Ligand binder design. Structure first.
Ligand SMILES: COc1cc(-c2cncc(-c3ccc(N4CCNCC4)cc3)c2C)ccc1C(N)=O
Length: 292
């Protein structure tokens, strides 16, 4: 079991629980400890790795899952590979980017998101999966320059068979207009895919600001840094996105670079108020693959 693991250092804490860096047979591993209030998030994220056999170069790599439960207490561990460089959010604050490194990040995310979204058939197939909490803090930077998508505790699934949610359980800063509007068609699975594309558009913006061009770059800032306070409320986001119909502003420098200009058009096509008008994960991958 994973009782042979040494918990060295805590790297993340929050409502979900905690994530620890740990050692196991000489190798660093990440250990997510779920509080007993997140037990269903533990099982869901485990079942995707345990039963659906979720694996992809840009999805966080599962290692093991353990639950031990007495009447005294219950422990819930999810064990995955460890990524020293941390989250895309931490990375972007300490690093600038160039044409190649930026593309590798962006295309890497689009590849992981599209594999999540696309249903696969057969004995080794997978249902369509919606993340529902895409954001820079849930994307990890790998040593090789690529990224992988991490937290799947809120993901939903859809297969070719009648069948996974009630409402709005994501990070409010990244919620799409139809979520803040409550216009979202909760009964159409594509609705949740289009929510991810909105979040992915914000992450594209975050990354692009950090790509240097013509000797200039932008400090890191979160989406909507200029119009909402830290930890914005549901009403604050609805006012900026729906009523004021605000969108992250595009610096004028982006248009003097080919890469940044292509990204700008991609972002905007992820931000249409109408979800049906937004690009798909696959077409975002294709477009990104053709750049440079
Ligand atoms: C086990 O499962 C998850 C694991 C991770 C995850 C995997 N490898 C690395 C990290 C990580 C390590 C260090 C940091 N830095 C904090 C700021 N200072 C610099 C170091 C950031 C991230 C993590 C969090 C992520 C999500 C899950 C999950 N299942 O949601």
């Amino acid at each position: 079991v994973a009782r042979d693991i040494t918990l060295l250092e805590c790297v993340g804490k929050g409502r979900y629980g905690e994530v620890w860096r740990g050692s196991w047979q000489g190798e660093n591993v990440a250990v997510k400890i779920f509080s007993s209030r997140d037990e269903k998030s533990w099982f869901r994220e485990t079942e995707l790795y345990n039963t659906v056999m979720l694996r992809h170069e840009n999805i966080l790599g599962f290692i093991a899952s353990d639950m031990t439960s007495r009447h005294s207490s219950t422990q819930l561990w999810l064990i995955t590979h460890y990524h020293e460089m941390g989250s895309l959010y931490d990375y972007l604050q300490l690093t600038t980017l160039d044409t190649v490194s930026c593309l590798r990040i962006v295309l890497s995310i689009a590849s992981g998101l599209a594999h999540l979204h696309i249903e696969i058939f057969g004995t080794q197939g997978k249902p369509a999966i919606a993340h529902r909490d895409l954001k820079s803090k849930n994307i990890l930077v790998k040593k090789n320059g690529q990224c992988c998508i991490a937290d799947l505790g809120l993901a939903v699934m859809h297969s070719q068979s009648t069948n996974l949610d009630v409402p709005r359980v994501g990070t409010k800063r990244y919620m799409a207009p139809e979520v803040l509007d409550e216009t979202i068609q909760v009964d159409c699975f594509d609705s949740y895919k289009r929510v991810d594309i909105w979040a992915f558009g914000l992450v594209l913006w975050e990354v692009a600001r950090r790509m240097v061009s013509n000797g200039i770059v932008e400090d890191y800032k979160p989406p909507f840094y200029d119009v909402v306070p830290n930890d914005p409320s549901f009403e604050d986001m609805r006012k900026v996105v729906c009523v004021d119909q605000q969108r992250p502003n595009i610096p004028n420098r982006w248009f003097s670079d080919p890469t940044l200009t292509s990204l700008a058009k991609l972002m905007k096509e992820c931000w249409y108020q109408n979800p049906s008008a937004r690009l798909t994960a696959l077409r975002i991958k294709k477009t990104l693959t053709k750049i440079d």
